[PDB]
């Protein structure tokens, strides 16, 4: 278990993406402004509150020195930002009891604090989770392609749509289905609506792939590595959901632009591991902060370009779109 | 003619491919399963019976030392892998009756074997070659541009429709009207189906090609090396006829998901030539034999993360083209 | 001020294009010729004049020693070449009365002189500006994301528009709504055409990039570079627009041919930037006048092979779309 | 006069293209074949006569000692191989008597010889190049783009439409409207039409450019190099003409396929410059007609393949189109 989450943060840094869905998005500015950038506002709702900032800390590690070492840099990140912090799967906790690397809230009380389980678990041990990390939210991750590509993986799935009725019936926080970098597709989100699902996590590919990751493990397999949808062509093909679903977006985001881009395509909120991952291994928590910091600006700035004031404006906002996921429209 | 086959063999093994219409493919995975790995099932039918698996060893070689070295390795893999292995063209050992490089069977009793030979041989040798080689299927290639290129090649084709009516009057098990690497258009499949031919491999451009060796050998012409239709293309101009004739898609296979990609578009199973000949020249037969039936485990795992629990259900996936497939739809 | 000039020199011309939308233009031209090379006609008519020439030297520098050297020797291009200049922002002026880098007509009596101020200027300094520079044209540039990404950038907009009425109802010379190569949108020229506007400069993406520049100066946000639309799709999007408002293009333009492609498209008059600071920065006075008479013979020269006898005969001239402009006027 | 004609044999060897609109043309093949390839049959008809092949020498030289060297070179290639040979522009000739480069039917009485000379000839000179130089056909060369490139070149074009019009009625040989690779437009071949002109060469972008050629002279104006169409849009923007036309097609014809494909989209007849030119150029006079017997074998093998016993069988053949053409014929 402790060498796993230690190999996932190993190879996840390794990667080198090679297309961005980003890239492939244009949206069309706004010369003549309307707005100061002092009245630009950053807010969001979704998973049954209001949150001050619009991008998270996505779910990544625990289970091992290096995870307690990192998510601690993560919470003082969060805290100090104001900004969901997910820690990774809680699982590694729940088989030792004795492990101490996700908690961070009692050293952190203003944290907004959220946890992870796969869905492979039955809901004892989500509610389990639940109790021991008193978590905003949870997110629930389905991660097939992972799990058959791990020789320690899952074999079994004809339990998960009853366990994902389980938790939904069960859970007393609010649940987010949640992908894993091969971005969720629509079936999906209609089957989790009609179960109660209310929230998810589209998590596509152009970051960080497992399918790579559990491939530089096994040392096999390299020609499954760019598996699924784009985050973007997720987000896409999500269109019809995005006002009965709360839509998450993740996978491959660098920077405030992709934050952006995923906003105007009525996103609730855009999550980052990858690249918050890289920034705590290269700078200072004192220079993360800052930069996250840096963050919320150019939040505002990208948003006064576009004449948008509020969060919600930014679905008003006219785009092009070209190679891949032009071409991807064309068939839609 | 040994030479020749050898050539073949050496040529075949230098080509480097540049365009892979596969490539060009992208399928809409599942996020939330439904099956167990253990309950998805890879039989497919065609040419009158059902098959365990749904890939084969396509005609290559025999009617050379090193032919038979090659087809004793390629029986080893195939029987016990359980899977069809089709031998190269027999014309060779109808020509020198003392070659025994095609006299797999008597080894391996268990074997399912097929043979070849080109539609320019009267009806008569097929069904020479039938009963001497007793096959499950007899392969009856067209390979114009190959005999057009070949210093030593045909020159008269006039012939060819009467003999593909022949051979389907005539021949006792059933005929597989067999491509080379040029794409078999629809209205070759129209004519062979109005003859009585019931299954075709479309053999198409992205693999070996045979333009390329001949053109090695001849060391002219290589402005004709990408002749012809890439596999892809044949497979999606042929859809008309998926429900008539049997479609048996093979070029440029390099990996189990270019199998499901042929098996979504309606093919019922898959050849392999230079992926396979290239794995017995570099491992050993029982390393061999290790990746084969890793290829199994493999189909199953992406099946799991389609939501397929048959090869026919693999027809109900949904998919993106790009590139030069994506341009030609848009032409059809 | 005068360092911030001078770097504006130093990394406009430092900065290398890799996209260029007018290499996305093709022009049908005519095999068969009706004109002399003698009789085509250069006019065109915008800013409430008819002018000899459909291109002009645009907005650029003044405030510096570098400033004034410049602006001198861009004077002496001009006024030989009977072609409008146009200087940098006059506010360093307004700032610093004792700068002289503006004072190019008392020793060129003959130069078509236009100035230029921001919008976030109240209208008093715009009167200022037109009184003391006796200019042909004012321009009055929009530059929000330039001044977002500065340090000692302006924060507060909304007045911008409030501006724009005032310099529209007081300004008694000719006004330019002026972009500086972000790409004048569509709903920017409709809000400044109900306020009065009659004339534009698109000034698009596709050579000098303000938020490259703007970012080598604070070493920060490099990912918005590529901010804005390019200068083909600004004048295309722009399209309803042209015989109400009159269009001036700029941003990326290298040669002749690329002036040709705006007039194509309804442009009244082609602006260039860092194409002759080069110039300036490179070759003689006199050998930039050269190069410039020879732009003239190049225009006529290019319209004689398009069968186009006056400025206004290339609207008719037929054209093929491709790459980015083609993949976007399909969404149009 | 003589130096221009060695700076263009010069420079047209030197020029490296990098876009053949030929490679964006896919052919649909046929499987199954029909015909014997002793039966394919190569004649096609245009300018008043059957001929034995559809290939054919076209215009390059003649007037320096060079030109005499390469005419006899090509003369001997064309006689050998029963093709048309069109000499260079002869309008050397008519300005120096003396000139003996252009003769060579005295010693070649079975060639089939075609001259050349440009549309700003008045017709006495066309009379005159016709009358010594008894020629089968009489190509009249559109240049406009060369000649306003060229520091010698024409400037005065008035006249072309009023000299065409002399050319048609009163030239006793076929004539031919030829350009000279900036590809003929659907205009041009209308007013040609209506002047009694009845076959063209659309001479299109791909291969030999004269905008590169003038300009590598003059060490200016590389920016027009891409002047024009490419031979393949050239083709398919003149298709509404193609039967009341005969359309001769050439411009970066490389080999065989590249001449099939013209001929595909109703092309009479293709003609080779910069191909047979360096081919001169490199090997003996009897390997270049050894090479081009082949192409005649290469041609019949071709149209075999595409079950085609005719030229005019070629018409009928299915086709894929790609990149520049592909988008083009999306906006036609
Ligand atoms: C080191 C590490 C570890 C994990 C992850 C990622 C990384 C980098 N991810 C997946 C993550 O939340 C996200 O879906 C993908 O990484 C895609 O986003 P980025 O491209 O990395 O921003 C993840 N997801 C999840 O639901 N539970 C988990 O425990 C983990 N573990
Ligand atoms: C060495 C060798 C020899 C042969 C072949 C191939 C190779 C590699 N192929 C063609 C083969 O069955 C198939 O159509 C192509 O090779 C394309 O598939 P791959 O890309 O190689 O998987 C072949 N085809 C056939 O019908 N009869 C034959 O005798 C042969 N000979
Ligand atoms: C050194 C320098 C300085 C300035 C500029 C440019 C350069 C190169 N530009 C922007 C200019 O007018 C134009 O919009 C862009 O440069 C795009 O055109 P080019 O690609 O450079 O031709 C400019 N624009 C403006 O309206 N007022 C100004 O003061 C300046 N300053
Ligand atoms: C050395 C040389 C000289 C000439 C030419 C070409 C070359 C290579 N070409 C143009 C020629 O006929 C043809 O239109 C172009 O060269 C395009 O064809 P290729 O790509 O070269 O096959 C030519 N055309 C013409 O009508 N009269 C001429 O005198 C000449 N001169």
Redesign the interface.
Known sequence: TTNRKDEHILYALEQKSSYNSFDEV?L???????????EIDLSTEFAGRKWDFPFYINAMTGGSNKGREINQKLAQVAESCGILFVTGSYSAALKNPTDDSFSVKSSHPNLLLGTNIG?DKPVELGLQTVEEMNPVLLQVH?N??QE??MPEGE????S??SH?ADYSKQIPVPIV?K?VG????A??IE??YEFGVRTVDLSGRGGTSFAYIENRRSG??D??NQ???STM?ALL?AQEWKDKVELLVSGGV????DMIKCLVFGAKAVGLSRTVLELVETYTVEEVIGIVQ?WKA?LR??M??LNCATIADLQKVDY?????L???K??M
């Open positions: 244009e069309i500015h706004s010369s003549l402004p309307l707005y100061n950038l002092d869905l389905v097939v392609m058959l590509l074999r079994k799935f004809r998960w749509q994902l289905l992908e091969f971005g969720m597709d079936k999906t089957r989790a096999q397999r020609y499954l598996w699924g949808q062509q093909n660098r920077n405030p632009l840096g150019d700035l990208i006064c370009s092009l779109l070209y190679g891949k032009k071409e991807a064309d068939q």
